[PDB]
Design a protein around this ligand. Structure first.
Ligand SMILES: NC(=O)c1ccc[n+]([C@@H]2O[C@H](COP(=O)([O-])OP(=O)(O)OC[C@H]3O[C@@H](n4cnc5c(N)ncnc54)[C@H](O)[C@@H]3O)[C@@H](O)[C@H]2O)c1
Ligand SMILES: NC(=O)c1ccc[n+]([C@@H]2O[C@H](COP(=O)([O-])OP(=O)(O)OC[C@H]3O[C@@H](n4cnc5c(N)ncnc54)[C@H](O)[C@@H]3O)[C@@H](O)[C@H]2O)c1
Ligand SMILES: NC(=O)c1ccc[n+]([C@@H]2O[C@H](COP(=O)([O-])OP(=O)(O)OC[C@H]3O[C@@H](n4cnc5c(N)ncnc54)[C@H](O)[C@@H]3O)[C@@H](O)[C@H]2O)c1
Ligand SMILES: NC(=O)c1ccc[n+]([C@@H]2O[C@H](COP(=O)([O-])OP(=O)(O)OC[C@H]3O[C@@H](n4cnc5c(N)ncnc54)[C@H](O)[C@@H]3O)[C@@H](O)[C@H]2O)c1
Lengths: 258, 258, 258, 258
């Protein structure tokens, strides 16, 4: 779809599952060269690698924990070693776990902040460093959420991580705009990743989730991957510092019932 | 680029010049059927029609003043008469004129509100009516500005019109989401439309405009047309109620100078 | 409560009822000199005048329709004639009426825009002109709503008027900040004015209103009047261009149900 | 000024200097019972205690580092032990340090996040727990910044911490609204605390700071303390989940130059 993405090198964190996997595959369809970071050898990154190649791309995998600076550096170095450059960095890894806020253990708060916000900072930091050093007009996409604007009871750490990610992105976008580097957030609403489809199998829970979505359906991973491909492309040449919400209307509030 | 736009009927207000013209031409490249509304026979809508056809589309022209309800209805009827349906409505017409706010004549305020905000309401209203009557999963794009969020001294009427357009869009998006209708704003920053390129020919004024733009350049009309094509396409299937800023970073504030 | 408000001249539109009345009486408690604008003498503005006086203030009444520039000018002139100056302008008059948006008559759209947005522009324009000409470090308070940020199906004209008011206020605040003039919005949520106690008399409608309010109760007019007294006072000396939401949490979304 | 604050117990972090000190003294003027948390005894917290007392309040001091959960718990325990209850928690401690973002050490990132965001989470968590357990209609004030909305090149950790604080506050306000607990941010612009008078002593730096402020002056600490006293008081009974910016117009953008 986007001819300019052919041959671009894109690194994606948390790409063995979910939205990261879907983005990897979509960049494959665009004939990009994808670095699939994954967290654990309990996962199946090689299946993603095969799907990216089948779709029309090239791919390698690399284990790394985005809460470890050395591992983030190694993700970037993997792009350089395997494909010779880096063009697009997608900080997608994230976690969540609900607990009443007055009871939330500090170590749970810390894990969510470290993965979701600090990890995205480190990935952004490392990619931008490389881009500035090598005069690359690179692109960073940070995977946020509707929860960068909509508060989330029982998930104060998650909300804080995404609200922080918004200002992190805006600051990096402003700081590095003169270098021709673009930095943007995607804000998904409720998406039918495997894990979410399973937890929302219960018809009552499913209906509750859908009640929050004006469009009336839970989105598919490909509908988020579409956004990432567009933002990374030169079609979005004049777009930086934004959050592009792809949420079925969730940021408007719950579905309207007359 | 977007195969699903082939054969879609798109009506664009204020399309004899500027961003409306650029959007018309881009939808031509996507093989759409374009209704080019224009304000005055002092303009050259037929040149746009020819460019849309050359680009790969079909096109007709229709005169109409978006501050006249009958004329807005006639724009929609022109789509139905000429092409048999309407799929995408783009409310692009606008005006501006700077005056210190405490001195702004009411008739100037009224003209800007009527064109920029009421006109977009009427166009949105009429398109959505048609879509609901005919079970069309249609799309409305309202042309806003960075001035839906950034205040604009000497242009209180313009700012108010765009701030209002934001809530107009969000409300229609929420109200009609269950009908499969998407409604979004585009928020351009400073763009090199012919009129702006002329007024910004003065090197000092040009530099002042550029100083407000983190990316350091004034955008081209095609960079806005790219956004409209994407939003109207099924790539943006899960996107409604947003404002997609395409502004070189202007909503981040002025360019960063260390 | 605020010693600096004693003897300040405050003009309030729509002050014979509802929030405007409550604000008039509160400024009376602060020993201000209040210009009570009213729409019709069938509203009993003289009863408000008497309540302002009993509360500790001075007051006069003046009829005027904020959709007529001459009447807005006459409100400001009344302050000058009766009390010798103007210090605070509160643009409070407003209307609403729900209709499905694709069916909303232009007449209705126009009435809401004219009252709610253009009327506030004219009152702001006129007060600021006086303040600038006379070196008054004046204050303008525009009565907005949570609907300057929360969309409102069936009320697209109302939402547009308040979204516009946000950018009107921000623009005036920026334009006139160097003159020492402050301009701010108040954003009430659901308030138990007489008109809304009627609107929400039905127990099921009331319950539904309350369900949208995290604090769980519909506010009282005095809770809004408190905000206006503070913003007008020197306690808020460093506050301009804001919207102060007083909404029981409505902008957070509906009440949280675990 | 606010009669309902007499005898209320307010704990304030970072209260030996700057805005925290100013808030302590202002609550003293309101005849509150103030718990002055301080970081080091080299800051002379007992001088603040004496100023609170002279102003009309009661006060105790307690050392604690808000990056240690046990110290945060001990702040809350100090209120209970010394004064018998807690009514208002003000999470004010903060740090900053500018570094180009691609060069920012993780250690520095971590310190800013831990102090500014995690520290405010822990103080909020602990106060809210107490309030819920004891049926107190308590209040939390988190000291944010204009940088919860305005990006800040070279200060990505600071901006992230405040952007996160916004969503932390909104989430807690929503989660606990039904308990009658209010949670709000204050968003100062540039304030003439001792540390910033030092930072901005240079005339050219000072002028540049002022150029970003529509009102044209750097605020004084008492102008922020005024906001905290109001938000903590029953005047703000219907106010929760907001950010009250007190910034001379900074969120509007830089001062307007025609
Ligand atoms: N799916 C949704 O509905 C939804 C909605 C909004 C936002 N998001 C965001 O999308 C992103 C992807 O999540 P998802 O929904 O695909 O869920 P997911 O759990 O499938 O994906 C998250 C991935 O991150 C990886 N990961 C976790 N911690 C990591 C670490 N320390 N280092 C490296 N990898 C790590 C996980 O192993 C997993 O592969 C997240 O940022 C999430 O917040 C998802
Ligand atoms: N060019 C920019 O830098 C820029 C930036 C932000 C937003 N915008 C927005 O883009 C839109 C298009 O403007 P543009 O920059 O191309 O300027 P333009 O003046 O070339 O285009 C505006 C068009 O609207 C038409 N028009 C005006 N009043 C009308 C009426 N009553 N009925 C019908 N048509 C009418 C004009 O004749 C003209 O063709 C506007 O909404 C404007 O606010 C432009
Ligand atoms: N009460 C609420 O819950 C609520 C919520 C959000 C915002 N508001 C806003 O508060 C303001 C006051 O409304 P209210 O709730 O007290 O309702 P209200 O209807 O009781 O008061 C509105 C007043 O405005 C006057 N008015 C209307 N059109 C006018 C005109 N053309 N010229 C002069 N006066 C005119 C009416 O006569 C009336 O006295 C409005 O701006 C409204 O949008 C109210
Ligand atoms: N002064 C301004 O212009 C300004 C502007 C916006 C926001 N703020 C915010 O106001 C708050 C107060 O800062 P300030 O300007 O008064 O600066 P300050 O440096 O004078 O005060 C910060 C205080 O926090 C204390 N502190 C720092 N780390 C701590 C820790 N780990 N544990 C306990 N105490 C600790 C310091 O010792 C100091 O007393 C901060 O949150 C800051 O971000 C200040």
């Amino acid at each position: 779809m986007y001819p300019d993405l052919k041959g671009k090198v894109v690194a994606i964190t948390g790409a063995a599952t979910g939205l990261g996997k879907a983005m990897a595959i979509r960049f494959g369809k665009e004939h990009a060269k994808v670095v699939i970071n994954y967290y654990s050898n309990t996962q199946d990154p090689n299946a993603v690698k095969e799907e990216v190649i089948k779709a029309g791309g090239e791919a390698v995998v690399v284990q790394g924990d985005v809460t470890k600076e050395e591992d983030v550096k190694n993700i970037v170095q993997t792009a350089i070693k395997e494909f010779g450059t880096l063009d697009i960095m997608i900080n997608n890894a994230g976690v969540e776990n609900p607990v009443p806020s007055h009871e939330l253990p500090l170590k749970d708060w810390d894990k969510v902040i470290a993965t979701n916000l600090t990890g995205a900072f480190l990935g952004s930091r490392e990619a931008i460093k490389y881009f500035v050093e090598n005069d690359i007009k690179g692109n960073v996409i940070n995977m946020s959420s509707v929860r960068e604007v909509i508060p989330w009871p029982w998930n104060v750490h998650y909300a804080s991580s995404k609200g922080g990610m918004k200002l992190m992105t805006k600051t990096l976008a402003l700081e590095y705009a003169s270098n021709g580097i673009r930095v943007n957030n995607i804000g998904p609403g409720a998406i039918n990743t495997t894990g979410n489809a399973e937890r929302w199998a219960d018809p009552k829970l499913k209906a509750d989730v859908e009640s929050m979505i004006p469009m009336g359906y839970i989105g598919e991973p490909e509908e988020i991957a579409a956004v990432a491909a567009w933002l990374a492309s030169k079609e979005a040449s004049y777009v930086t510092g934004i959050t592009l919400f792809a949420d079925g209307g969730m940021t408007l509030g719950p579905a309207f019932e007359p």
